[PDB]
Ligand binder design. Structure first.
Ligand SMILES: Nc1ncnc2c1ncn2[C@@H]1O[C@H](CO)[C@@H](O)[C@H]1O
Ligand SMILES: Nc1ncnc2c1ncn2[C@@H]1O[C@H](CO)[C@@H](O)[C@H]1O
Ligand SMILES: [Br-]
Ligand SMILES: [K+]
Ligand SMILES: [K+]
Lengths: 330, 330
């Protein structure tokens, strides 16, 4: 009996969401489909140009934890907010979903991280993130008992941007593996991969990470190739299990020489791709920690991801457990 | 030419929105379909029981102002927030829509008003509102030049709950009428009417209010009758123009002995009724200040209301002017 199926660790962020036309991205030099890091001044400037918006709790790993809880798994989260209204919102939403969240704010400045996410007509999302209080996440925020009691500890590639978060993750890896648990990461973003390519490969090759999540763009970036088949062969050689998503083309799960291809679900419309990779990870890890086959893990992931992209906001507002039952997956 | 078509005045509120089951309202003694006023302690309690939520700028008059601007009219707004993150969200969203909004916060405490809005499976909304900084709105917040330069000044019945807002409205009425402008009010909520019945009737009978908006429930409450036909006859006798909404049954506009019935638009599915009345007022007032017939004002009102109820959140995220053009209302 273990307390948690999945612990996730990431940048605790509230999303500020608006729809824009494609010229808006060009005029403001926002890299489309990417996570664009911004300072406080740029955040104010961008906000001043943004239309009326919606707010929703975000953070890649936060979304993944919420998804696992939604499906019926037991989840926990480490991430740092400020003692402010945005932080109170973040804390409420993740705990309300049934995720264990106990990371204490350190003060009111820097303020809670926020990401201005612009959704274009094609449903693509372009994020503009001020890290704020996320820069204060460190080893002191590792709840050692929680890591020890979680089947899988999953973390964001994005954690390599703030200065001390990587130290916390190294502590997590040691505790997890001392207790026979598994470590997982997502490559997060192709530009994130570009920034930390050598470090990410070292995490995988040293065995600090057991299960890796990537999309097509991240996998291509990791090996700096345009050959997707090369990327798949290389990622399989670098980690024990790789789960590679391919948008409308579904996903492929690799283990050694094993490959399991899974189809994307049928969708009404792509409203907002925000959270797709996050929720794929939720589905996958839920299945993984329930002892499901790798293909069925992929199927659960594709289900969760296809659901999230048909709504505004990064965390499904409907029951994923009910959808899984109806899809005949649980 | 006047600077503004519509000035609105109301409680500046950020909405915190979640879906709930029918049992949740009963268990928490929340009056369904109503605005339930709550103190700080109850706000904390209710939030602790609320699921993961979405935040969006609200406030009945705020929504109406935003709707006028969306349609292409020139709008302004008076309402008091705190110097906090919620207040900064509110200020951003209304100004981003192109509404003139210059009410300065008086400090961080009390904090910005928020309303926990619970949406049931039928799409009905039940609001639970902590007024916070709204209690500070007073005569000092009247921008006299704006009232003087606005074709219509419209305000909430809800303004009778905070202590000094009514004094601001009486100042508005004097300035508006001295400058040959018109005053309008919404009855807001049937329990609000029950609280201020005598005062609302006096506003109308004294001629401080020229145009009144009501739904069926509010009209029935105003005259404490269950005879809707009596309520229509009475409201017509009490104000120069009455616009009375009847949910799926459309609307009726009254002027003296004239009655103009308008059909509601036919809906796929009612997602969330939040903002329906507010946006009916936006369409009506936009039409009115453009010199349109009372029937066409009612038509524009129903168009805007039908749009807002098919989305989560109180302010339409799509173009109302484009919708009106397609409808030949222009
Ligand atoms: N730098 C970042 N680190 C972690 N998550 C982020 C970052 N920027 C944006 N996000 C989150 O990514 C989510 C979608 O994958 C959004 O909900 C958003 O909050
Ligand atoms: N007491 C109140 N005064 C004014 N507006 C309110 C009040 N309570 C809730 N609202 C707003 O009513 C809107 C729906 O008509 C919501 O957007 C909500 O913000
Ligand atoms: Br704050
Ligand atoms: K989404
Ligand atoms: K709505």
């Amino acid at each position: 009996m273990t307390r948690f199926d999945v612990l996730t660790v990431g940048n605790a962020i509230v999303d500020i969401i608006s729809r824009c036309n494609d010229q808006f991205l060009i005029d403001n030099q926002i890299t489309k489909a990417a996570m664009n890091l911004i300072d406080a001044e740029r955040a104010e400037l961008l906000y001043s140009r943004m239309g009326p918006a919606l707010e929703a709790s975000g953070g890649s790993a936060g979304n993944t934890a919420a998804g696992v809880a939604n499906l019926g798994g037991k989840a926990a989260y480490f991430g740092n907010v400020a003692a402010d209204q945005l932080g109170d919102i973040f804390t409420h939403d993740i705990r309300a979903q049934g995720v264990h969240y106990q990371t204490k704010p350190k003060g009111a400045f820097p303020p809670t991280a926020r990401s201005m996410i612009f959704v274009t007509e094609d449903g693509e999302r372009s994020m503009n993130t001020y890290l704020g209080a996320c820069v204060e996440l460190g080893p002191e925020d590792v709840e050692a008992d929680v890591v020890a009691d979680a089947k899988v500890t999953y973390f964001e590639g994005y954690l390599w941007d703030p200065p001390r978060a990587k130290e916390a993750i190294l502590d997590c890896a040691r505790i997890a593996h001392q207790h026979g648990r598994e470590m997982s990461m997502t490559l997060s973003d192709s530009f994130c991969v570009d920034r930390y390519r050598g470090e990410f490969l070292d995490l995988m090759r040293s065995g600090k990470v057991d299960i890796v999540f990537a999309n097509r763009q991240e996998a291509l970036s990791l090996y700096q190739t345009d050959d997707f088949e090369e990327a798949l062969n290389r990622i399989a050689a670098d980690c024990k299990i790789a789960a590679v998503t391919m948008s409308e083309n579904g996903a492929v799960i690799l283990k050694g020489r094993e490959r399991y291809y899974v189809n994307a679900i049928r969708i009404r419309e792509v409203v907002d791709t925000t959270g797709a990779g996050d929720l794929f990870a939720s589905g996958f890890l839920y299945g993984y920690t329930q002892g499901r086959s790798l293909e069925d893990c992929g199927k659960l992931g594709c289900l969760a991801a296809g659901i999230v992209i048909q709504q505004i906001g990064p965390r499904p507002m409907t029951s994923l457990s009910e959808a899984a039952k109806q899809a005949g997956l649980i």
